[PDB]
A paper describes a structure:
Ultrahigh molecular weight cis-1,4-polyisoprene and trans-1,4-polyisoprene (TPI), which are the principal components of natural rubber and gutta-percha, respectively, are also isoprenoid metabolites that are assumed to be synthesized by specialized prenyltransferases. To investigate the molecular properties of the EuTPT proteins, we determined the three-dimensional structures of EuTPT3 and EuFPS1 using X-ray crystallography. Similar to EuFPS1 and other prenyltransferases, the EuTPT3 subunits were composed of 10 core helices (α1-α10) with a deep pocket that included two DDxxD motifs responsible for substrates binding.
It should be noted that we previously characterized EuTPT2 and EuTPT4 as E. ulmoides FPS proteins, referred to as EuFPS1 and EuFPS2, respectively. In the tetrad analysis, ScFPS, EuTPT2, and EuTPT4 rescued Δfps lethality. The superimposition parameters suggested that the dimeric architecture of EuTPS3 was highly conserved and unlikely to be caused by crystal packing. Interestingly, the dimeric architecture of EuTPT3 substantially differed from that of EuFPS1, which formed a conventional TPT dimer. In EuTPT3, α6 of one subunit interacted with α5 and α6 of the neighboring subunit to form a four-helix bundle, whereas, in EuFPS1, α4 of one subunit was inserted between α5 and α6 of the neighboring subunit to form a six-helix bundle of α4–α6 at the dimer interface. The structural difference is related to the chain length determination residues, which are conserved as bulky amino acids among FPSs, including EuFPS1 and 2. Specifically, the equivalent positions of residues Cys94 and Ala95 on α4 in EuTPT3 are occupied by Tyr88 and Phe89 in EuFPS1. The side chains of those residues protrude between α5 and α6, resulting in a marked bending of α5. The TPT-type dimer formed a larger hollow at the dimer interface and supported a hydrophobic tunnel reaching through the bottom region, whereas the bulky side chains of Tyr88 and Phe89 appeared to prevent the formation of a tunnel in EuFPS1.
Author numbering:
A (entry chain B): 3 to 238, 248 to 342
B (entry chain A): 2 to 342
Write the structure that this text describes.
Amino acid sequence: DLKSKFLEVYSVLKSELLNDPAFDFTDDSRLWVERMLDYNVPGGKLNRGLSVIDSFKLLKEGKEPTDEEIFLACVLGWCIEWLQAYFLVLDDIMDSSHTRRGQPCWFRLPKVGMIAVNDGLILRNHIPRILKKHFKGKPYYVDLLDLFNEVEFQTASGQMIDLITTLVGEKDLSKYSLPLHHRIVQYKTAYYSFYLPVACALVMSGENLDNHVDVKNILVEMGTYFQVQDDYLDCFGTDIEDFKCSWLVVKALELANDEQKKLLHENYGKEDPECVAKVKKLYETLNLQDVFGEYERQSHGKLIKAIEGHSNKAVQFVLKSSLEKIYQRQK
Amino acid sequence: SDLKSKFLEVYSVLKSELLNDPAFDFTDDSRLWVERMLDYNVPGGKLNRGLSVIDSFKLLKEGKEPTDEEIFLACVLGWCIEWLQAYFLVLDDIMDSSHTRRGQPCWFRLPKVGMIAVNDGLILRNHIPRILKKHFKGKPYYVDLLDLFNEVEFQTASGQMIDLITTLVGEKDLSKYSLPLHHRIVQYKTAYYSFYLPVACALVMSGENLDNHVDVKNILVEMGTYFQVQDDYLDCFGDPKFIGKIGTDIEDFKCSWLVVKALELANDEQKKLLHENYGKEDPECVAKVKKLYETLNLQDVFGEYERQSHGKLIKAIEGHSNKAVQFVLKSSLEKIYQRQK
């Protein structure tokens, strides 16, 4: 129903981009861009993109959204998926990764290499082209541009602190802390994964985003909790191997004794299954599955009370639906 | 100079504002990181594109003295152009596996940076909206600024794409290289951001609608194409002391204007000579290619191209109905006509 229409809208947007009047395409560059698009953009699960349409429908009370609206919401969802693909291509380059969704990373294919860097740029610059094409006549056009620019800035800044914390500070693991993890996760994932889709739906609904700081705070907290879920599922996956500032290692560094904190310092993300076995058993000995369960339900309580504090029924429906889609997930 | 010093003072102001940005939770580490990256990559060049914004705005302000506030806003737009260029240059140095820029190691070459520089490029680009929002959000031409910068960035990235896939992908047949492909690469990769964008910023500040200045855009794009032809010529026949570096376009198998004109002017033996020497590093082949350029008299062909381009541009410029616009375009032309650096 909606998902099929979303993929159809992908085909529409790709056609428009490959007939863009701002660039003089030839067969070579048109085929290059179309292969790059098909390899990097539509292959994911597209949850963030479709949540735009979901949120827009719930904010239109319990009524029917029209046809234009459905198309527009799909276009904004695809803008979010384009943003994510743009970040992922460059992240795979920076992480020297090999595989994504079971296929080689874009930059790993022999005819691309570091060209993929520029491809990342292309992906990002497709978002204005799309927006201009479908929202230039709308009165909230500039709000869209400001929203996407600010969320992109925040995601890049979160990636920066993740990079510097890890690669520039794996001397002392003491560095990893609970506020540092919270900040990294809030800026790198929460704004674009949870705030941005609902903010798109709100802007389309005619709302001023400056009157919805409550919604933004709640969604940022919910995204932090989502990424904690991700950190937990990576181990219970190469976070330990990659010396990442995971929630699990941070909680372990706060709950262990001097001997177990010595164990962590002397076996964290330093190659070999050996080293990765010791970390997992330290996690078991501290019973980090019960700490994560307690954190999980406690966060759930926080979020539901905060959500029921809001004065708009549709907003409550949106936030409650977002929460239950991830509550006690295994994937 | 007076205005260059004021321009660098405006850089300091913009950097302070960016390091106190309310949209991000800075700590000592990331604030020092962003400041070390900004100072290393943004203010160290010649800032010609940035300062041309102020020059163009003052030329368009026929008759009525610009305020200090207007000069500051023009400086801000010039710095946005320099930020865009810095972002592109950081990523280009990564893609080209370069080693040094302006006599110092490339940002990604420093041991504590490496591939972090990729994300640093992103940071640089996303500084441009932060700056614009900070200083122009209340202006009625704010959205025109955003559209201008987004579209020029799209066109620059696309020009880089066709340059990369022309040079790197496929086999390395030198036949593909042609004059239309060179024109397309050069127009989209350099001309829009180096020549159109500064003047367009000055025009937007003047209250103009850019949709009524397509002629200006055409003239500036053609002028930027001519500028990059000059750069291609000087990369081989220029002076390394005056330019700053030694040109390696022949080694790097670039779709230069010189090799294209050589392939259109040579005979079968000289085109085979070109096929068997262009694009390898060792100076024997480079010297054969350069002396072929000499025997083909590519210097005099370039001189004739330059004076034909000058005549064309002068005629097109004097076709325009606004004298201030004509002054802007002629000032842009005479700064580069017969330049040596």
